Amino acid sequence: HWGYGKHNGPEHWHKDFPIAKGERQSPVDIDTHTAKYDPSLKPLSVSYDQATSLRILNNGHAFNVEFDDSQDKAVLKGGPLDGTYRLIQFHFHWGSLDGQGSEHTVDKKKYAAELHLVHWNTKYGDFGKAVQQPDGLAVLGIFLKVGSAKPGLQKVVDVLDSIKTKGKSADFTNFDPRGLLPESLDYWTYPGSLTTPPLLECVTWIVLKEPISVSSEQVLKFRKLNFNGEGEPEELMVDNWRPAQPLKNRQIKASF
Ligand SMILES: [Ir+4]
Ligand SMILES: [Zn+2]
């Protein structure tokens, strides 16, 4: 029964998920002065040309755009990663106001939203096995700022009316996630966790330095979603972000 409210939000999660207080929790604040350039990293290989989107789901916490991950169709490689990670879904976190919403912060700055493209390590065969491994997942995180509209987002915005409430899904085929990327693939990377329960410490985080711009109208449509199910009291789906967690014994590396 976890969520983002006063009674079930991030300050409560540790009671059911004690790893909430673990050594490699996400998100974190990225201190851009302390992050060290790691000339040994590599360029990110983002290979989304064959991506096959299937469906969009309101899961009561966010909405997920789901992909066919039954073969190596959309994969992330290179950078800090060893081997091949397959795209399974993307989702966002966003705020009630444009001054909050991101999970990661940059020198304590909060962005209006954050996109997470979730990928699993094919050496573990399936997502459920991958999340049990310290190198099981690679999540590409992209900040969103409010300014100009992001044309590649509007097809997502267009369908939200059809998945207003928890448990609703819609067909979402032929969506190209390349239209969500910024121009630069410069990034920060560190070892962390899922940012929602079960908070498993299985993620290599790759956070792009360049935000994408979306319009005020695009984000306002995110904020019309509901956390609740159909015919239940309306609770707007806003402020679905976990705040920054202790960095502990970790180093954030810069690709640039
Ligand atoms: Ir309850
Ligand atoms: Zn996320």
Side-chain angles (χ1 to χ4, degrees), residues 4 62 64 89-93 103 114-118 139 193-196 205 240:
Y4 288 102
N64 289 357
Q89 53 103 330
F90 71 75
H91 61 273
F92 303 81
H93 306 264
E103 296 207 309
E114 186 174 328
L115 167 59
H116 291 162
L117 293 129
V118 181
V139 182
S193 76
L194 305 179
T195 72
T196 51
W205 275 96
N240 61 348

Side-chain angles (χ1 to χ4, degrees), residues 30 49 55 67 88 93-94 124 156 171 175 187 199 228:
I30 299 166
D49 179 66
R55 194 175 70 142
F67 287 80
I88 178 164
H93 306 264
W94 62 89
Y124 300 122
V156 171
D171 301 300
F175 180 80
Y187 63 89
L199 302 172
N228 55 280

Side-chain angles (χ1 to χ4, degrees), residues 3-4 9-10 13 27 61 92-97 99-105 110-114 195-196 227 238-244:
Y4 288 102
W13 296 348
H61 307 297
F92 303 81
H93 306 264
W94 62 89
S96 52
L97 308 157
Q100 63 198 66
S102 68
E103 296 207 309
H104 295 88
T105 58
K110 294 174 171 159
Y111 288 88
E114 186 174 328
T195 72
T196 51
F227 286 128
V238 297
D239 293 317
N240 61 348
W241 49 279
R242 188 190 194 190

